[PDB]
Amino acid sequence: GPEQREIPDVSTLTYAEAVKKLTAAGFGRFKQANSPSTPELVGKVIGTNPPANQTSAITNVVIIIVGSGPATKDIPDVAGQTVDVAQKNLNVYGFTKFSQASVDSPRPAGEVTGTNPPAGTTVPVDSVIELQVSK
């Protein structure tokens, strides 16, 4: 038997599968990374550095990359309503981290004038949205 062990091809199906089977293969040295990719493949391994078809020495660090599917949303238009009410509606369908930018109030005041990124821009929901409010 070689010092190299074969990497199970169940990794492709799920990270959980990868780890358990690879653990049963004798590997205990891992390096994990995840990269944003096609959301419908979230949680599965999208690639390992040691191949599933070749045998790799068990002294090797297995670099396992997980397919990460982030929650992203387009910032909607909720301008024309109050800062408090706008954040509330937007939060339900969008983001939880807000920042406020003061813009000059000609006629509207207190009400949301718009968003920092142009409406329709899709960004990670974990990212901070800046709301343009009439000071």
UniProtKB/Swiss-Prot annotation:
Coiled-coil regions listed: none
Induction annotation: Expressed predominantly in exponential phase. PknB levels are regulated in response to hypoxia; its expression is down-regulated during hypoxia and recovers to aerated levels upon reaeration (at mRNA and protein level).
Annotated knockout phenotype: Essential for growth, it cannot be disrupted. PknB depletion in M.tuberculosis results in cell death and aberrant cell morphology, and leads to complete clearance of the pathogen from the host tissues using the murine infection model.
PTM remark: Autophosphorylated. Dephosphorylated by PstP.
Domain PASTA: 1-68, 69-135
Physiological role: Protein kinase that regulates many aspects of mycobacterial physiology, and is critical for growth in vitro and survival of the pathogen in the host. Is a key component of a signal transduction pathway that regulates cell growth, cell shape and cell division via phosphorylation of target proteins such as GarA, GlmU, PapA5, FhaB (Rv0019c), FhaA (Rv0020c), MviN, PstP, EmbR, Rv1422, Rv1747, RseA and RmlA. Also catalyzes the phosphorylation of the core proteasome alpha-subunit (PrcA), and thereby regulates the proteolytic activity of the proteasome.
Subunit annotation: Homodimer. Interacts with the FHA domain of GarA, FhaB and FhaA.
Family assignment from sequence similarity: Belongs to the protein kinase superfamily. Ser/Thr protein kinase family.
Domain notes: The intracellular kinase domain and all four extracytoplasmic PASTA domains are essential for PknB function and cell survival. The PASTA domains interact with peptidoglycans and are required for PknB localization.
Protein name: Serine/threonine-protein kinase PknB
Species annotation: Mycobacterium tuberculosis (strain ATCC 25618 / H37Rv)
Lineage summary: Bacteria, Bacillati, Actinomycetota, Actinomycetes, Mycobacteriales
Gene assigned in the entry: pknB
